[PDB]
Design an enzyme around this catalytic site. Structure first.
Site, short mmCIF file in Angstrom:
data_model
loop_
_atom_site.label_atom_id
_atom_site.label_comp_id
_atom_site.label_asym_id
_atom_site.label_seq_id
_atom_site.Cartn_x
_atom_site.Cartn_y
_atom_site.Cartn_z
N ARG C 103 0.84 -1.21 0.00
CA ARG C 103 0.00 0.00 0.00
C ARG C 103 0.87 1.25 0.00
NH1 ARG C 103 -2.74 -0.18 6.20
NH2 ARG C 103 -0.73 -0.37 7.31
N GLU C 142 -3.63 7.23 6.64
CA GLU C 142 -2.31 7.26 7.27
C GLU C 142 -1.23 7.79 6.33
OE1 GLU C 142 -1.59 3.31 8.98
OE2 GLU C 142 -2.30 4.02 10.93
N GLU C 314 -8.50 4.37 14.98
CA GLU C 314 -8.11 2.95 15.08
C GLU C 314 -7.54 2.64 16.46
OE1 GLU C 314 -5.44 1.87 11.90
OE2 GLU C 314 -6.58 2.90 10.33
N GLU C 362 -2.45 -8.74 6.96
CA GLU C 362 -2.92 -8.54 8.33
C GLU C 362 -3.86 -9.65 8.81
OE1 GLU C 362 -2.45 -3.65 8.38
OE2 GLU C 362 -4.48 -4.51 8.30
N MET C 364 -3.25 -11.98 10.78
CA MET C 364 -3.02 -12.16 12.23
C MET C 364 -3.38 -10.93 13.10
SD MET C 364 -2.14 -15.28 12.20
CE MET C 364 -1.64 -15.59 13.89
N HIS C 365 -3.95 -9.88 12.50
CA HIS C 365 -4.37 -8.69 13.25
C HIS C 365 -5.78 -8.93 13.80
CE1 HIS C 365 -5.40 -4.64 14.42
NE2 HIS C 365 -4.30 -4.11 13.90
#
Ligand SMILES: [Cl-]
Ligand SMILES: [Cl-]
Ligand SMILES: [Cl-]
Ligand SMILES: [Cl-]
Ligand SMILES: [Cl-]
Ligand SMILES: [Cl-]
Lengths: 656, 656, 656
Positions: C103, C142, C314, C362, C364-365
């Site tokens: 990204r 971000e 977030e 992500e 595992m997020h």
């Protein structure tokens, strides 16, 4: 601000005597002590007396303008006298006789030896009490040294039973005061009561405390008989005794009531190496100068014992013999210690000895001279101090007598009570807790904040102090509580204050006892701690740890420090505060800085190893560290030394 | 599962007495001990007796439904009695008299004091032996406390010479048994034999062992005279003595033969801080709860001494006075210790004391009340336990008496022998080796595996145990060897088992002596080690280290552990095993897990600080750590507490 | 005090959508973010658009009463678009293209990509700008993440040369401002100037600073084009961007001028483990909760960037994927972080994500749900917070809107300047010095004293603050100096304040430059230090050490702290103070306590791991430690939680 020396003419041929006195004068010595170990020279066999040596010595010293401090020789009576009076000998705690062959071989309770002392002191006082050389008398020599206050012989028991009858009247009253219902200890009569040593296990703390008090009173009585003789036959002479560092076995304030001057014996390198008070880091860091407060603490304590009048009778001049390790002092350390004593108001600093002896137990103890009569390091340092006090006197427009009269009192008082010391040593309750250590560490914190301090007895008038600290005033007399109730300055009462009655019981209202009307709180119980567990402290005034002693307290007073459970550590408001745990050095300084501010006193976190004290318009600065540090007081000018204070160095400033 | 308290009505005004008893009842207290230190109240001068106080106190306690344990007052005889009988006083190992002024001031060998005890115990037993308040008698108080078993006075020597004649018959037989040819020690007669103290160097171990045995027998005899009087005049009353933690100087099994109940005095915080058994980490980790096995070890030992019947006569309720450091217990710790005792089959847990005394040696020892009679922490915790035992009883459908009757025995036995303890303490051979420490560390390993344990004497029947461990059974009697030969469970014999004869000699076949027929091996020699050298261990059952004691062994038995040189460490097969080195905690657990499996018992490596014990269908779980941990037994439901065991917390489960 | 969630309807089958929205409502979620990564779903190939999914999703969310934050999808443009515009791709500092496959694959300088953004944002804003579900827009996602502000491609150089011409006018003026006479750097024209990467050695700090400023301005411009479109087509909607922890590469105050709300993304466990700011002890101690000031610092900074309006877009709900180590949060930590944000005035706390994705980077997020749609730990904690805010609102008689409107400003301001950050990072001069670290450690000291704080830009009005701290305000604008001259509160200027001109030169009068008229002193030179040498500090206000930065200063101002050489460390009088060395945490607290007292503010040394903040009459207390600690504010009553604050726990009190 005068210099002295301890001298033994009886150790040297008469051919040395005129030279010794002239040499003393050249250095700047004004006072000389003689005679305290000379009984075997005076009277080698009973009735055969030898005064000629002393007659001649005093005349020689007088002819050079030296003022003499004459010591009574009762610390070391001869063997013929010991053999005549076997009941004079002390017994140690283990029950063994403490014999001839060293010094201090008597119990203070011995009535037979007291009569022998009456005889000899009368003989000496009649012969020399009006001699123009004699300015002062020292009674005996270091009462209590080698733990000689407590003795466990028949004479001590006889005196104890009489002392108890005088205090209590009836044995019934004693049994009630001691709580002797406990473990069926009840006595039918005073003559059933034994010494508190060699019991199966722990003796009654009331028994042990009254025993300590009685033994201390025997020191008072022993000294008083000599004082009465010297008052009669030597009017106008200063009567003095030489006290010690790190020694608490008799009441020095009470002995001091009968004397004109408190003197003491300062050996900073010996005490640093020997005393368990000091940490491993301190013993290493300060090896060659002593801890920065080792002299200071005692100068202030003994100025109090002397009702303002302080001497140092014996000042370390070089390596000593008696500590486990005996290093040479740093170059300049003797000068350092001398100015140190003067900054605390010492009238006189006397070294010991004049010339290192080549024989006996102390043959390795240094003097101003080596055993061959050549000068050692202290001779040059002493000479320099004498020159520097003349420079100081001239700079501030004073003569020697005016210089000595400069004010010495601090506006902060720390209350030290020998009776509290005995109580707390008898049952420390945590083995890591020691009254003396706690007092010393509270004092160190004050000194690290640059404060000038008085150490005072519990009967002292309080009106001249803005801040008053009672580190652990275990028993508070009704008269002390009245003085506290009317005191207008700032009060900090430390842990264990008001925790005991006069007869070693817990007060009816619990701790802090009589103080609770002034500071409403209740010590519910005590958490008595080993070194390895040091609970965290936080609150309004700081963060850190507490150690050793941790009181569980209920109060409505505001808290300035608390533990993690929210239990009060330091509490109070207005002008009255109570501390219930032995907080660390950081928190001691934080708290003392706040309390000083309430009291209108300034504080300053001095550099490590640096100390300061004031006498009127004179500022004395000291560096006990191994490196140069800058100290510059505001609104003042340099008189002695420099703004860059060297290692083991002194600077003296005058206020503008 | 009942509660008690130790009480001193003679310390408090009579105006308190009714209130004290009512307050005790409110808490749930059912038993009260009085009288053991009251001789000076009863007889302040000979022949003038005061029973009125006790007559009234017993009636008040009875009126509130409290059952009384009456103590004979012989631990603390009065000073008038001591003065009449100077031969009653003990001497310490250094040869000094152990005097009046504390407690326990007599030698057990004194025939004069025994007659005085006969008089007083007869007087008391005749007056109160049938009083309806009196349920039980405690003889004396803590026999041996302050190391009072061994005494070195004339009376002790007189008893020793008579005891030796009774044992050996002729001095010739004694000389042969002791090996007195060595260093020309041979005696011509019993009256040539001296006490074993104050010798030039090490006395004969045979001499020292027989001396210990004799002194222990004097405790047996001293106690037996009181028991005989109490059996005659107080039929139906439980006779008990109060034993101590970490105390081995007399044979507690032998004294126990003459009594109905073994009680003991548990002060977990004092023993943790004081005892060299514990590591620095343990002293820090468990500061406020005691080591997880400190109570447990003694509960099991004394249940054995009591032939099934165990009380705790004195339970710590708060900080004590006598250890070097005296912390406050963790919140919940008094509850913890109480349930702990109940899990080991204690009928009664009695606290001490009821109200903290404001006078005497123990003025800082906490009670259920503070010195001002307000409740302290233990009062609330005791109240909670009393409520919780009612909840437990109801949940499992039992009344109080049925609850107490729940089975308590473990299926694992650890054999503890006082005679072995004396032998091994006399010559430890490595200074790092201690019999008691080794027994305790073997026990700790068992407990970390979740095992319920009995500790048994060497004469105990063995048929009820599946696993039997002899940590160091130094001498094996022929009768014990017969019991071992027929034992059907699993045996582990530890190092030094069968290494000595009855008279302190090496067996003719070498160690392990009589055991060699059961476990064929030979201890060729011993490597006795300092802490700094800990040889590596490996083998079938695990890896780790050994320390302190390292036997060099020859055997054909299979090895389960060996050192790096291939020398046997743990060896055996079927149901018999021998351990020749003091293996570490890891290897102890590995070995005990294997041995337990052979014996049909389950094991579980519990979380750190957690312990479990069973009584029939009830599971008791304990957390001595400072954090919450999960314990969930299988096939059971919660009755008290939670699956998430808090710090210093208890949970109780019942099997489904 | 509202809750939100970040949601990806495009990751889940449409059969989940109604259930997702209903479940969100049940938890208490009121706001939902969607759309910021959806460009490949919207436009998989150019000109073929898919809005149906989003049309339907917004309607479903609206039907459950959820307010939507719609993200523009410009953070992740599709590969077809990248392939059409190769000049849009950034280059890293090493000169390599930063490609598609993750990204943020664009440089902010790309004019071609800006036109593509204009197209897509216009399309979205026209379609959805008046949709009743859409309450807010997030621009992009971000900005700067993965160090994407600085780029070294042709487009960046082209923008830089234009930016320099606009700033300086002539290259002659630039050469003078940069000092390009040094090392013959002089440029004949703007088109001779290169990027500052890949030089032989260190580039001109003026060159690097102007480059940072230009790149930051490209972020401002990129954002502003989206804002202008959204203002036109979505009037009334809150425009927001989501900023990050520990990220300083663009000016967040300047970007914030164009937006309505500052939001940020808080992952306390990721930042603790990843960031070199934190010590090894901190990383271990706070593993499962984050450092006590990690959120706090940024909540205050971004409240300033938002001109009072702060959201958390977030919030960490469970373990993340991106740090080197990714622990699970402590039980209660999500609640802790949520209340934490509310105590700093956050209007909204939004979690991320709603449901853990089973695919991509992500996977595992964690989210509020597991990948199988069952609830994870954050769902229950979020539910509890929603209930607790209703309890709070009712207790103080406020509705939800009034609750949110509670005042949030502190009376202490810390001035943070991105331009100063860039300057000091460009030449730290000691590698141990970091502007951000120093600001954070000054902030930590304030927070350990219980202070509520604002962090403010250099152009902020100062009249509402009693104490103002400039940790290192490297360049002082003439306008800031005017504001400082008239400021009526207490000022502390920290080291390096006023040490640089606008164009990276030393001021003509030396440091502290424009501040010297207010605080007369001269920084003669700098002692820039490694970690291993930490000079001792002493003085009026405390003792301790300094590290990293040690200014050698000449001044006549009074000194409150000095080094051992007597050199000024902290100096000033009245209301103005300068600090010239990076003093330790102890001394920071000592100094801030003194300065707070001058400013009329109270301080309190909170227990370790405890923090407090106020909003009007509400007191929020937090415990980030692993043990229970007592916090009891005076004159207040408990609303939520307890006086005994558990580990990772929150208590809320109201003033009486
Ligand atoms: Cl001499
Ligand atoms: Cl003494
Ligand atoms: Cl009692
Ligand atoms: Cl013993
Ligand atoms: Cl999602
Ligand atoms: Cl960047």
């Amino acid at each position: 601000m005068k210099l002295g020396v301890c001298y033994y003419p009886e150790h040297w041929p008469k051919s040395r005597w005129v030279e010794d006195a002239q040499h003393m004068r050249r250095i700047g010595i004004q006072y000389v002590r003689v005679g305290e170990f000379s009984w075997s020279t005076i009277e080698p066999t009973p009735g055969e007396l030898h005064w000629e040596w002393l007659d001649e010595s005093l005349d020689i010293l007088h002819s050079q303008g030296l003022k003499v401090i004459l010591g009574t020789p009762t610390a070391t009576p001869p063997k013929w006298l010991v053999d005549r009076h076997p009941s004079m000998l002390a017994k140690d705690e283990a029950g063994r006789v403490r014999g001839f062959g060293s010094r201090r071989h008597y119990t203070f309770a011995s009535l037979e030896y007291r009569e022998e002392c009456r005889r000899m002191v009368t003989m000496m006082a009649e012969r020399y009490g009006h001699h123009p050389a004699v300015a002062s008398w020292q009674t005996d020599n270091e009462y209590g040294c080698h733990d000689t206050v407590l003795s466990y012989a028949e004479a001590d028991l006889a005196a104890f039973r009489l002392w108890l009858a005088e205090k209590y009247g009836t044995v019934e009253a004693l049994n009630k005061a001691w709580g002797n219902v406990f473990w069926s200890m009840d006595y039918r009569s005073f003559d059933e009561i034994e010494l508190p040593n060699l019991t199966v296990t722990e003796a009654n703390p009331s028994h042990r405390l009254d025993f300590q008090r009685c033994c201390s009173d025997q020191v008072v009585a022993f000294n008083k008989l000599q004082v009465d003789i010297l008052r009669e036959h030597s009017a106008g002479r200063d009567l003095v005794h030489n006290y010690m560092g790190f020694f608490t076995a008799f009441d020095h304030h009470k002995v001091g009531q009968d004397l004109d001057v408190a003197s003491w014996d300062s050996y900073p390198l010996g005490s640093l190496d020997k005393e368990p008070l000091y940490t491993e880091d301190e013993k290493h860091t300060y090896l060659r100068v002593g801890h920065p407060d080792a002299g200071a603490f005692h100068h202030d304590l003994y100025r109090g014992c002397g009702n303002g009048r302080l001497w140092i009778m014996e000042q370390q001049p070089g390596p000593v013999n008696w500590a486990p390790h005996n290093p040479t002092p740093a170059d300049g350390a003797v000068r350092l210690w001398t100015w140190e004593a003067f900054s605390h108001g010492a009238e006189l600093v006397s070294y010991f000895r004049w010339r290192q002896a080549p024989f006996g137990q102390e043959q390795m103890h240094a003097g101003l001279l080596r055993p061959d009569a050549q000068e050692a390091e202290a001779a040059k340092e002493a000479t320099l101090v004498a020159q520097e006090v003349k420079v100081l006197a001239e700079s501030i427009g004073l003569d020697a007598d005016e210089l000595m009269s400069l004010p010495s009192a601090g506006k902060v008082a720390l209350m030290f009570d020998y009776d509290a010391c005995w109580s707390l040593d008898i049952q420390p309750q945590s083995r890591a807790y020691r009254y003396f250590f706690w007092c010393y560490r509270m004092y160190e914190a004050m000194r690290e904040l640059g404060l000038s301090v008085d150490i005072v007895p519990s009967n002292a008038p309080l009106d001249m102090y803005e801040l008053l600290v009672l580190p652990a005033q275990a028993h508070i007399t009704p008269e002390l509580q009245n003085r506290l109730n009317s005191y207008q300055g700032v009060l900090l009462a430390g842990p264990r204050t008001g925790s005991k009655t006069e007869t070693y019981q817990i007060p009816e209202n619990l701790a802090p006892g009589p103080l609770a009307s002034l500071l409403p709180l209740t010590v519910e119980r005590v958490d008595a701690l080993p070194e390895h567990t040091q609970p965290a402290v936080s609150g309004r005034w700081g963060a850190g740890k507490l150690k050793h002693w941790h009181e569980q307290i209920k109060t409505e007073l505001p808290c300035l420090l608390k533990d993690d459970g929210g239990n009060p550590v330091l509490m109070g408001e207005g002008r009255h505060y109570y501390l219930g745990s032995c907080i660390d050095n950081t928190l001691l300084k934080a708290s003392l800085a706040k309390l000083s501010e309430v009291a209108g006193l300034s504080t300053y976190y001095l550099p490590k190893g640096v100390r300061v004290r004031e006498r009127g318009n004179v500022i004395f600065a000291f560096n006990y560290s191994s490196n140069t540090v800058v100290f510059e007081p505001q609104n003042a000018e340099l008189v002695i030394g420099s703004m860059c204070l060297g290692a083991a160095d002194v600077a003296i400033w005058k206020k503008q």
